Every structure is written in structure tokens, then in C-alpha cells.
Amino acid sequence: MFNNHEIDTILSTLRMEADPSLHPLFEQFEKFYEEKLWFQLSESLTKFFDDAKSTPLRLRLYDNFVSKFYDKINQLSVVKYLLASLKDSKDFDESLKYLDDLKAQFQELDSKKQRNNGSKDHGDGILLIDSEIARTYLLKNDLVKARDLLDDLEKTLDKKDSIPLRITNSFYSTNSQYFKFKNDFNSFYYTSLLYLSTLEPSTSITLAERQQLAYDLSISALLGDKIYNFGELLHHPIMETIVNDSNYDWLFQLLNALTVGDFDKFDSLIKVQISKIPILAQHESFLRQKICLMTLIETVFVKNIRMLSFEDISKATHLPKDNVEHLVMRAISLGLLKGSIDQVNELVTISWVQPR
């Protein structure tokens, strides 16, 4: 019987420990547990979880109450109740052992349970709790183990298992916890290309989420110190979603000009949108380089060039003969060609080009 046993003890104690405001809600909690209605009990417990009021009660609740029926209820509902109470502790190692032990219980409590059709379904609960262990690691549990686990989990973002988008999006937070566009934008653009590979029709995302992903990828390319090929980005189907909002149409036309060497359109957007935005202003002198670099690379590719002259490069860049070689020396430094400058003759011996 629940009377004179753990459950009566828990209801009694937690009602005393609780704020008076919580008392009427816990009548439904008591009832639905006694009725064996774990799901209605979870709605009642979710209505408690929805408020910061008395959050620590949920730790005892998890340990001594939810643990009796967590096999039936949704894995993320279960971990959310523990998460709020264990986050209140401001600790990053008990949280590790708790999420690992909880996850491992579900790894043995289930084999064909909570599945779409008693099938080899996605582990669309503990796959995200695995990310929560990783976030907890990256939250300075131990930096060496965290960095090693980050590298191993990055090597696990592949079709080695039937990973859904949600685990990758969850681990993408853990990558963002370690590296950002502020550290390097070319890297963050390539990190964003990972997320594109996982994008498919999923409840996780919308057309608006695609618009935000396209826009953030666009900033990452624009400000990418070593990116040059904006064309493959600008043509990619994900960049069609933003054409159905166009709030940033000026960015995509600045990008378009920067994809074709249209100095006049470039200058016209540069005269306005740079001044309005400090992040873009910090890169203005890179963008004017990027247009010159790409204009020449297109010229080299389309005209299959092997020899060019500083005066003709000066036409194609609007940089004076006295400095124009430093521009193509940046291109050589980007590694997108194997040519060499012949400064003695004010010539260049161009060789090869990276198309993408």
C-alpha cells in the first residue's frame, strides 16, 4: 500500500517543504499516481516544472518517485524534471553521473519499448540525453576528457548510426560551447555545412529555421577570411528559403555582387549596409579584397589563364600597379592556385585554380 510507505511519506514531506501555492496542483499528482495514470501524473508534474517555485523538490521526486515508473513515461519528460532540480545545484559532475546512470537505465529497461512500432527506431530521447552528458562535460567537468569526447562525438556525426537531426542539432550546441564564428568564420561556415547535411523534413525545424540557417551561413561566408567561392553557397537550395522573406535582400545582393565582381553594385551596397552594421564594418577591408580576389579567380578560370600582367590585373581590381601584386599574393596564400609572381617584369605566371 502507498499509505505508511515511501509515496505517502513523499507527498506529506514535499507538501510541507513546498510553497503554499503548489498545494492544490499536487492533489492531481497524488490522484493520478494512485490511479496508475503515469501520463496524467506527468502533465501535473510538468505544470509544477513550468515554475521555478520549489524546484529542488523535483530531485527527491526524481530519485524516489519518478524512478518507479520512468520506464513508461517520455524519456525527455523524465530527464527535464531531474534537469531543473540538478541544474539548481550549480554542479557539473553529479549532473554527469546522474544523466549517465539515468541514460544507462533506459539502455537496459528498453529493447523494443517506446519505439514507433517495436522497431529499431531512433533513440529520440537518450540520444539527446547523450548530448546533455556532452554539454555537462564541456561545462568544465574535466577539460581534457571534454575535448577528447568532443573530438570523438564529432567523428560520430556521420551515418555510422541512424542519427536523426535532433541529436546533431543538440551536439551542435556543444560545438558552439567550444568554438564560435567570432574565433573563425570559415570554420563556422564549414560547421554550418554539417547541419545542412542533416537537414531533412523533421518536426525539429521549419521553413523559418531554414531561413535563419541560410542567413547565418551567409554571414559566415561573407566574413570568412579565406572563403572565396560564394557561388556554390548562393546557388544551394537552402538559399531559396530566404527569397520567401527577403528582410536581408540587400545582404544577398551584396553577396551576389561579391560572387560576380560587380564593383558598382558592391560599392552601392557597401556605401550603406556596412555603416549600419558594426560586425560588417569590422570586415569592410576584407570584403573589398574578396571582390578583387574573386574577380581575378573568375578571369583565370573562365579564360584558362597561365600568364597575366600587373596593369591588366590593375583594371580587374582597381588597385594600383604599385600594390596590385599583394592582392594575388593573398590568393596564393589562400592556396586556391599554384602560380608565382614575376615582380621583376611586373608579370605573373598563374598555374592551376581551385574551383570550389
Residue 22 has a CB neighbour count (10 Å cut-off) of 18
Burial-class residue 50 by CB neighbours within 10 Å (0-12, 13-18, 19+): exposed
CB 95 within 8 A of CB 69: no
> How far is Cα 328 from Cα 12, in angstroms, rounded to an integer?
77
DSSP letter string, 188-240: HHHHHHHHHHH-SS-TT--HHHHHHHHHHHHHHHHT-TT----HHHHHSGGGG
Give the technique used to solve this structure: NMR
Beta-bridged to residue 309, according to DSSP, are 347
CB 112 within 8 A of CB 82: no
Continuous segment of H or E residues that includes residue 83? helix 75-87
> How far is Cα 225 from Cα 185, in angstroms, rounded to an integer?
7
Q: Could you tell me the CA-to-CA distances from 208 to 145, 194, 219, 236, 238 in Å, in that order?
A: 36, 19, 17, 16, 11
Name the residue type at position 66: V
**How do 340-342 and 347-349 pair as beta strands?**
antiparallel
User: What range defines the domain where residue 24 resides?
Assistant: 1-356
Number of domains in the chain: 1
Q: Could you tell me the CA-to-CA distances from 274 to 264, 268, 280, 311 in Å, in that order?
A: 15, 10, 5, 30
Residue 157 has a CB neighbour count (10 Å cut-off) of 17
CB 86 within 8 A of CB 95: yes
DSSP-based three-state secondary structure for 310: helix
Residues 6+ apart with CB under 8 A from 169: 195, 198, 204
Q: What angle do CA 70, 74, 80 make, to 5 degrees?
A: 85
Q: Among 43, 34, 48, which residue's Cα sits nearest to residue 5?
A: 34
C-alpha cell belonging to residue 307: 600568364
